[PDB]
Design a binder for this molecule. Structure first.
Ligand SMILES: CC[C@H](C)CN(C[C@@H](O)[C@H](Cc1ccccc1)NC(=O)O[C@H]1CO[C@H]2OCC[C@H]21)S(=O)(=O)c1ccc(CO)cc1
Lengths: 99, 99
């Protein structure tokens, strides 16, 4: 679909069997989700944002369906203010910016 | 144009008679730019993301050119690690997400 930006580009995602709302975030290199239970081995990692760095759990090779489009990539879980879908997955669903 | 998301969506902008580089950021409600000494009044503000909040100066009705597309709106100036063009200006240049 084509998504205009008058509102936040929020979409429903499916990860680990449950639905969630997430933000399509072209300014994020990586995908960061709020605290949740996820099946899969994880490794402690750190990611920086506008206000500093946070501790996250890095799940590699996770299945995630974004607005009806399947992806399999890295998902970071930690105290992010909002669920953000970053470029590592936006590229997988074929997302581009257009103007 | 069409911008793929393999790499960061960096573009040249013109603001206050200066050229800078900034990210077309669908995850940013408002535009945030590095410290620059703009003229006119401003209102203090705090904005939050991954890592917490930074303090910024809010200027309104600032003229910005983005790839030759002119826009006018709010610009937040502060110690941000990266310049991001937010939705308040992305809408004004006709920018959409497409997959
Ligand atoms: C609350 C939703 C997002 C976190 C908002 N952010 C925009 C986001 O695109 C930032 C914009 C951004 C980009 C680079 C450095 C700092 C912030 N990207 C980001 O934090 O991504 C992180 C996750 O992947 C990593 O790659 C980039 C940093 C990592 S933001 O920078 O914090 C932000 C921007 C503008 C306002 C005012 O409306 C408030 C917050």
């Amino acid at each position: 679909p084509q998504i205009t930006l008058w509102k936040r580009p929020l979409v429903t995602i499916k990860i680990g069997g449950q639905l969630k709302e997430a933000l399509l975030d072209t300014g994020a290199d990586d995908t960061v989700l709020e605290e949740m239970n996820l099946p899969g081995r994880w490794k402690p990692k750190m990611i920086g944002g506008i206000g500093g760095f946070i501790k996250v759990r890095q799940y590699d090779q996770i299945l995630i369906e974004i607005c009806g489009h399947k992806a399999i990539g890295t998902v970071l879980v930690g105290p992010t203010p909002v669920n953000v879908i970053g470029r590592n997955l936006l590229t997988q669903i074929g997302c581009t910016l257009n103007f």
